[PDB]
Design a binder for this molecule. Structure first.
Ligand code: ZN
Length: 461
RNA sequence: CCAGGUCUCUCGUCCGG
C-alpha cells in the first residue's frame, strides 16, 4: 500500500461524503457483571480519548513497496499452488449477471442491508432500490452498469467496532473501502465460479478455511495436518502486500483458467478512494471492501508461505505441505519441523512483518495445545478424543457481552455467545450462566444447558 | 428518519415443501 496523493475532491469533481460521526455501541446490561479492557474505536478527529493525531494514525498503514518482481521462488510457489487448484476442476466460465447478483450454489446474494457505494450513495440510492430477490430482476443493474461502468472510486469509512485501550489512544481505528455495487457485480460475474469452488472446498487443497464450520471442521483439521505444526502472525498484512504478490496471483489465475480477467486484479491495484472532503489514490494493495478479497488474500498466503519454505529450506518437498488459511490467518504443517523465526527471516526481504503466533514474546514450538486458528484453540473431547472442540477463550466472550448496538438484540446476542463458550467446558460454561443470571435481565433470557449443547454437538457429527 | 464495505459460519424470528 502506498498513497500517491490526496487533495480536496472539489477540485476533481467528486462529492463530499458525510460519514456518521457517532458510535452505535452502548454499554450492556452486563457491562459491570463482567470485566473487559475494550471500548468503541475512535470515529473522528475530535475525540477526547486521543493521544495522537487521528488521520495521521488511520493512514499510517500504507507503508510502501519492498518488491515488484516475481523472483524464481515465487514462480515455483505459483507453479505449485496452481497445480493443486487444478485438481478441483474449477468452472472457468463467466457467471451470468443473475447468479452474480442473486447467488447460485456456493455464492450468496449481494448483501441488501449494506451501502451500494459510489455514486449511488451520493444520489440517495440503495441496493434494495436496484435489486429484487424475489423476481431476480437484472434489467435495472444492467442499465446502471451500462451507464456508470466499472472501476469506480471506493468510499472510505471508519469501522464502528470494539477496540482495545492502546488502539483507542493511538488512533488505530480500522478503515473500510465501500466497494461499488457495479464493481461487486463485475467481480462476481468474472470470479463467481472461483469463489464458489473455494466455498465448497475448505481443506488443504484450496489451502483455505473460508466456508468451514469450526464446530465440525476442527475434528477434520488435525487429520489433515502433517506431523509438525508451525504458524506465525503478520503485522498489517494487506498494507504490506507488494505488487509482486499481485502478479504472482494473476499468474495462478492464468494457470487455472481465468487468464482473460486478470486485468480485474490490476484494477484492484490502482484505486481511488473518497474520504470525507478529500480524495486519495493508492497504488498497490487490494481494498478490503472489495469482492473476493477474502479468497484472494487466502490465495496469496498460500503463495507467500510456499515462497518462504523454498527459500529457507533447500529441497523441501512442497507436496508435504499442509496449510489452511483464512486471509492472513493460517495454520500450517510439514512432516519435519520448521522454524518460523527462520521463515519470518526471509519474509523480511519481501515486505512481510512476521511475528510469533499469538502475541508471544518469542517464536516457540507450535503445539496442539498452543496453536490457534480463527481465534480458537483445539482440545479433544474428554470422552470422544477424535472429536475436537474449537475453544474460544472466555476473555473474548466477556468483551463482547459488555456491549450492544441495540438492546432489542440481547437475547440473540447472548445466546450466540453461549454457542461459543460451552466448548470451554461444563464447569466454566455454568459459571458463565451464573453471572449472566446475576442480573434481572439475564433471568429473562432463555439460555441452553451444557448438556443440550453437548448432545447437539455429538449429534451434528 | 436514515446514514458505515467484502465474506464465511452459526443461531433466532418468521414462512414454506
Ligand atoms: Zn490514481
Amino acid at each position: 500500500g502506498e498513497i500517491q496523493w490526496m487533495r480536496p475532491s472539489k477540485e476533481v469533481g467528486y462529492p463530499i461524503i458525510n460519514a456518521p460521526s457517532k458510535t452505535k455501541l452502548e454499554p450492556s446490561a452486563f457491562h459491570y457483571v463482567f470485566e473487559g479492557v475494550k471500548e468503541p474505536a475512535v470515529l473522528t478527529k475530535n475525540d477526547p480519548r486521543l493521544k495522537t493525531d487521528f488521520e495521521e494514525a488511520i493512514f499510517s498503514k500504507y507503508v510502501g513497496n519492498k518488491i515488484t518482481e516475481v523472483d524464481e521462488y515465487m514462480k515455483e510457489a505459483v507453479d505449485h499452488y496452481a497445480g493443486q487448484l487444478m485438481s478441483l476442476d474449477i468452472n472457468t466460465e463467466q457467471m451470468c449477471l443473475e447468479d452474480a447478483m442473486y447467488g447460485t450454489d456456493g455464492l450468496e446474494a449481494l448483501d441488501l442491508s449494506t451501502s451500494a457505494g459510489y455514486p449511488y450513495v451520493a444520489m440517495g440510492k440503495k441496493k434494495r432500490d436496484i435489486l429484487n430477490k424475489q423476481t431476480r430482476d437484472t434489467k435495472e443493474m444492467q442499465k446502471l452498469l451500462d451507464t456508470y461502468g466499472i472501476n469506480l472510486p471506493l468510499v472510505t469509512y471508519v469501522k464502528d467496532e470494539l477496540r482495545s485501550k492502546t488502539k483507542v489512544e493511538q488512533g488505530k481505528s480500522r478503515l473500510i473501502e465501500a466497494s461499488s455495487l457495479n464493481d461487486s457485480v463485475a467481480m462476481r460475474m468474472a470470479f463467481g465460479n472461483l469463489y464458489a469452488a473455494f466455498h465448497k472446498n475448505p481443506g488443504v487443497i484450496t489451502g483455505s478455511a473460508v466456508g468451514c464450520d469450526p464446530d465440525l471442521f476442527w475434528s477434520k483439521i488435525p487429520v489433515l495436518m502433517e506431523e509438525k505444526l508451525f504458524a506465525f502472525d503478520y503485522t498489517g498484512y494487506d498494507a504490506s502486500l507488494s505488487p509482486a504478490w499481485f502478479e504472482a496471483l494473476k499468474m495462478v489465475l492464468e494457470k487455472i483458467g481465468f487468464g482473460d480477467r486478470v486485468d480485474y486484479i490490476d484494477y484492484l491495484n490502482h484505486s481511488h478512494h473518497l474520504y470525507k472532503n478529500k480524495t486519495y489514490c493508492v497504488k498497490g494493495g487490494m481494498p478490503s471492501g472489495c469482492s473476493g478479497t477474502s479468497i484472494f488474500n487466502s490465495m496469496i498466503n498460500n503463495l507467500i508461505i510456499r515462497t518462504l519454505l523454498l527459500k529457507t529450506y533447500k529441497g523441501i518437498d512442497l507436496d508435504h505441505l499442509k496449510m489452511i488459511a483464512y486471509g492472513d490467518d493460517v495454520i500450517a504443517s510439514y512432516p519435519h519441523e520448521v522454524d518460523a523465526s527462520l521463515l519470518a527471516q526471509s519474509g523480511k526481504d519481501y515486505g512481510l512483518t512476521m511475528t510469533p503466533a499469538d502475541k508471544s514474546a518469542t517464536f516457540e514450538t507450535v503445539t496442539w495445545e498452543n496453536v490457534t486458528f480463527l481465534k480458537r484453540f483445539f482440545r479433544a473431547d474428554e470422552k470422544y478424543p477424535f472429536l475436537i472442540h474449537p475453544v474460544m477463550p472466555m476473555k473474548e466472550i466477556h468483551e463482547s457481552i459488555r456491549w450492544t448496538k441495540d438492546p432489542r438484540n440481547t437475547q440473540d446476542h447472548v445466546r450466540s455467545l453461549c454457542l461459543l463458550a460451552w466448548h470451554n467446558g461444563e464447569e466454566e460454561y455454568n459459571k458463565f450462566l451464573a453471572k449472566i443470571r446475576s442480573v434481572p435481565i439475564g433471568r429473562a433470557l432463555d439460555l441452553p444447558e451444557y448438556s443440550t449443547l453437548y448432545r447437539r454437538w455429538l449429534d451434528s457429527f
